[PDB]
Paper text:
Mycobacteria synthesize intracellular polymethylated polysaccharides (PMPS) of 6-O-methylglucose (MGLP) and of 3-O-methylmannose (MMP), both proposed to sequester and protect newly formed fatty-acyl CoA chains in the cytoplasm, thus modulating fatty acid (FA) metabolism and indirectly the lipidic cell envelope. MMP is composed of a linear chain of 11 to 14 units of α-(1→4)-linked 3-O-methyl-D-mannose (3-O-MeMan), blocked in the reducing end by a methyl aglycon, and with an unmethylated mannose at the nonreducing end. Using a combination of MMP purification and chemoenzymatic syntheses of intermediates, we identified the biosynthetic mechanism of MMP, relying on two enzymes that we characterized biochemically and structurally: a previously undescribed α–endomannosidase that hydrolyses MMP into defined-sized mannoligosaccharides that prime the elongation of new daughter MMP chains by a rare α-(1→4)-mannosyltransferase. In this elegant mechanism, MmpH serves as the recycling enzyme that hydrolyses mature MMP into defined-size smaller oligomannosides that are, in turn, substrates for ManT and MeT1 activities for further processing into new daughter MMP chains.
The three-dimensional structure of MmpH was determined at 1.35 Å resolution from monoclinic (space group P21) crystals. Although there are two MmpH molecules in the asymmetric unit of the crystals, the enzyme behaves as a monomer in solution, as suggested both by size exclusion chromatography and DLS analysis, and underscored by assessment of the protein contacts in the crystal using PISA26. MmpH is globular and mostly α-helical, with a diameter of approximately 45 Å. Thirteen α-helices (αA-αM) are arranged into two concentric layers to form an (α/α)6-barrel. At the center of the (α/α)6-barrel there is a deep cavity, opening to the exterior at one of the ends of the barrel. The catalytic base (Glu628 in G1d and Glu393 in CpGH125) seems to be conserved in MmpH (Glu262), as is the network of solvent molecules coordinated to these residues and that participate in the inverting reaction mechanism. In agreement, replacing Glu262 of MmpH with an alanine residue completely abolished its activity. The drastic reduction of activity observed for both Asp47Ala and Asp50Ala MmpH variants is compatible with one of these residues being the catalytic acid. Interestingly, in MmpH the volume corresponding to those residues is part of its large depression and could accommodate an additional sugar moiety, in line with its endo-mannosidase activity and in contrast with the exo-mannosidase properties of GH125 family members.
Author numbering: 6 to 351
The structure:
Amino acid sequence: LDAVPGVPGVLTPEQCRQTAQAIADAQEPSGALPWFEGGHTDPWDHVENAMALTVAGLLEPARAAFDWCRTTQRPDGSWPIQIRNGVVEDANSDSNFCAYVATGVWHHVLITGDRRFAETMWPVVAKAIDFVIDMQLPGGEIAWARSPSGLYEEALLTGCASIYHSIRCALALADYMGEPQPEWEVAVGRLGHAIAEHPEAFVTKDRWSMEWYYPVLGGALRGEAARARINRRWNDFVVPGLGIRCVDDRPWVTGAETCELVLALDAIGDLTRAHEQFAAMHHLREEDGSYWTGLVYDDGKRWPIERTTWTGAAMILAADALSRTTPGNGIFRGVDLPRGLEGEYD
Ligand SMILES: [Mg+2]
Ligand code: NI
């Protein structure tokens, strides 16, 4: 508009803005961006929503959301897994959820150039990434969760792939701030090595599409290895004309997973298939610009029966990447992100 993403024939800039406005309309007075009005909030989707608001130019609600991150961050640097209208429902810490604030903050700095925002959020990001690295296991993978009684010492490939990208975003912010973080550089290098070379470190979750594309989306796997991985499961997940399955054994396509795959395809230059998959998930779009979570494609039922802010948010981020509209559009492509210390693995 002309600053708002659009994809001709698929998504107008007006439609992109409308989806972002539906996210903003769900914001709680605290700044939380929940799944939907009356639903719960989780930190990862909260940040995802704030990134989409930034892309669409709704900077006021986006800043209120980042303020919520700052004001609710707990003493150890974490956020609870689940809150509902300010009532904590799951007080454990999910390492993936806590790290993602780094991505959202760096994305916001890329788009706005707002150094005062960077200075305000830098201690938030630093405390969060320090907390996440304190969950790293000896092999380099990250424990998926922490509770008051200790770490859950299983690692999830999707979460680790997301954290890998989040820490690289934290390192980009560290450079912007002029405050080197050698410990983060070591940690992210060891994490990337585990993702790439130690499959035995992660719980086996082969049926989930996110486990298939997240190593590519997060940048742990690129080039020939990434192209091979995408092609390896393509037909298990991609449903012609409809997007992609959340799990390989249910006739159920989901908008967010489709749009995350779009970002992964864009990252490896597969713009032909990125555009095809992006175009194929807009049957989930509702009249107010919000998106249904998913479709049971062999009977026509939406499932779950919910329109989720973060499905529209994922769509917006994919639209920005395809159109290369805002200065944050390439944050997953990651051309300029630091790599950390690639070596000395233990
Ligand atoms: Mg809280
Ligand atoms: Ni190794």
